[PDB]
């Protein structure tokens, strides 16, 4: 996102505003204002590691924009927006993740290598890989009889189409000591 | 495996009446060992379960997204709003006797995936068979009835 001093009004808020959000949601509900529409409007820019060196980036827009003139103990401990030099804003922190890790529920609540492991098992899984499975004459294929969408999903999974072609079933799990089997 | 690197093979299959039950009549589809939690530190596995339980009760697709303002204490308040011990646990009764289990078990759904390695695909045995031509020793692999 591009963040500039722009509007005399207050501080240095983002270039993109609620208007463009609705403008996009308009084209969304139609299924005119695309991604190229944000890009050529100069509200959003493409940055490589070499260019990243000469910028400062705000994590969340809101949580990283006004100033200080109670708190929930249950919530995590976040830092600050004391920077007034903000040049850009991160669309969403969860976009640092690739396809495999994007399927992990609450990965910010797991010891990091455990996440790297489920990044490999997601491949040794089953389900519908395509809907044309009955037409395809592949060397080997496994289709799960009754797949179920997951009960806990990530905002990112909506785009990975998992909800349509799932990898498992939601099992009623008891975490217990029984027979010892 | 769950979506937290928590893999495993089956140990045994039990029927409904051998299985432990909630007074509600709900029986588990899976029984996973508590031991595989502290060492691993898969807190997100437990949180998935608590959220997944809430979701099924209320007819929602539980947001388990990463950097959010969702709390364990928030979801716990919701699960109590449905009528279950806020932390997931439920008093269960042993299948063989009907007698209550002194411990309350953390029950509820977790999304589990079936993995591409079946035992009947791995199992191998040989007592004489095909031998290599040069070396005159047993051949390699299940397919080739190898040693």
């Amino acid at each position: 996102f591009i963040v500039e001093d722009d509007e005399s009004l207050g501080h240095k808020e983002l270039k993109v505003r609620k208007g463009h959000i609705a403008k996009l949601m308009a084209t969304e509900y139609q299924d005119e204002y695309t991604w190229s529409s944000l890009l050529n409007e100069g509200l959003v820019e493409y940055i490589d590691a070499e260019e990243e060196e000469s910028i400062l980036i705000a994590m969340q827009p809101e949580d990283l924009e006004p100033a200080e003139a109670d708190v929930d103990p249950a919530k995590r401990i976040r830092v600050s927006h004391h920077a007034t030099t903000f040049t850009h804003c991160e669309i969403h922190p969860s976009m640092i993740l690739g396809v495999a890790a994007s399927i992990i529920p609450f990965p910010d609540h797991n010891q990091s290598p455990r996440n790297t492991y489920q990044s490999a098992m997601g491949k040794q899984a089953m389900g519908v890989f395509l809907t044309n499975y009955n037409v395809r004459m592949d060397t080997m294929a496994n289709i799960l009889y009754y797949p179920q969408k997951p009960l806990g999903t990530t905002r990112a999974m909506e785009y990975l189409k998992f909800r349509e072609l799932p990898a498992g079933q939601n099992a009623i799990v008891a975490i217990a000591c029984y027979s010892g089997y | 495996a769950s979506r937290h690197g928590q893999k495993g093979t089956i140990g045994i299959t039990y029927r409904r009446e051998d299985m432990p039950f909630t007074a509600e009549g709900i029986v588990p589809d899976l029984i996973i060992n508590p031991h595989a939690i502290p060492s691993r530190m898969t807190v997100a596995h437990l949180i998935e379960c608590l959220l997944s339980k809430v979701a099924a009760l209320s007819g929602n697709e539980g947001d388990a997204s990463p950097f959010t303002d969702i709390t364990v204490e928030g979801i716990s308040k919701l699960l109590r709003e449905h009528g279950y011990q806020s932390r997931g646990f439920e008093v269960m009764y042993n299948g063989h006797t009907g007698k209550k289990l002194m411990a309350q078990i953390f029950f509820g759904p977790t999304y589990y995936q079936r993995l591409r390695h079946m035992v009947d695909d791995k199992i191998h045995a040989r007592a004489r068979g095909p031998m290599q031509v040069l070396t005159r020793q047993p051949v390699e692999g299940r397919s080739r009835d190898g040693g």
Binding site: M25, Y29 | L51, V54, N60, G62, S65
Partner: peptide
């Protein structure tokens, strides 16, 4: 707590 999908409903009612 859960994911918000009632925006076929929310967006059609507002616009």
């Amino acid at each position: 707590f859960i994911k918000r999908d009632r925006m076929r409903r929310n967006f059609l009612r507002m616009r």
